[PDB]
Design a binder for this molecule. Sequence first.
Ligand code: 3NG
Length: 329
Amino acid sequence: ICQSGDVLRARYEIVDTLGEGAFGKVVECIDHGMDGMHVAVKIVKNVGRYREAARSEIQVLEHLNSTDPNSVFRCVQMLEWFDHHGHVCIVFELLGLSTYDFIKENSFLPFQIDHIRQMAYQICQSINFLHHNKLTHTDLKPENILFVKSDYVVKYNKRDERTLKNTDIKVVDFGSATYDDEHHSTLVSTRHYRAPEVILALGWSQPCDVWSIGCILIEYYLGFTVFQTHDSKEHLAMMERILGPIPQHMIQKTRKRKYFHHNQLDWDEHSSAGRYVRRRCKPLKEFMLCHDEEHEKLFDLVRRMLEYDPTQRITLDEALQHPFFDLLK
Ligand SMILES: O=C(O)c1ccc2c(c1)nc(Nc1cccc(Cl)c1)c1ccncc12
């Protein structure tokens, strides 16, 4: 099935597990057919659910390769796919650590505002390309943003701390990507990066990605997940504490009645969970570690990404032309 030394399509020799999930595994292989060069191979376990989903992911990746074969817009490059005894195998270019894992290995230290500016721009560009081709990723998170090379310099400070030689990224995991004119799932996104219109089941499209990007940028800035919760009402409570009250037209629209009471969130601030929310969250501007002009610009862009109403949320067309990105051009 999957072993170190095992060979796929008479070619790819597994030499290291790079990670695991509910789908299966992603392994590093030596490609003997390309005189040794390393690749990453997503092996999908033989559950009928994951098999049919992979064939949709494959279709998206072929689409992105067709429209952008040279990865101008930084989507991961699929090299081939094949069946290996019931397991769907997808071969990818070999990339570095995820932006999540880099933080994790760097003592949970945040990225410097200048690295954030570069990465944010690349992320926005990549996802805007998806949005102009009638796609929504739906699952953007730091784990799905990977460095091309994770090469770092160690500099003693309090002890050892890491800095990227290069911040160029790629976006991975198109297994949930959805076209405009296709069946939209009810529930999308990993919990922490999920937009309020999803939680409230009002229907979603492109803008839900922008919300996720917002969540990602904050997490880069602070070095920790802002919505650390496994409960939807609590999640909504965290949003209100950070962002202000949920707009009334959205509360009126939702069928999710259990969250509300008289069109206000049914949340007790003086509970065990209420105390947890309050010590973990605060109004957005109060998160600013430094009070520079560019930090104000960043927090302005983030606020616009974290607009409650998806119809009023900043688009990525607009985001790319935001003052925060001026210092890059
Ligand atoms: O899904 C894709 O499209 C996808 C595409 C490429 C990679 C990937 C996922 N995941 C990687 N690593 C990884 C890290 C943590 C957990 C898991 Cl399951 C995998 C990885 C590593 C090195 N090069 C390319 C990749």
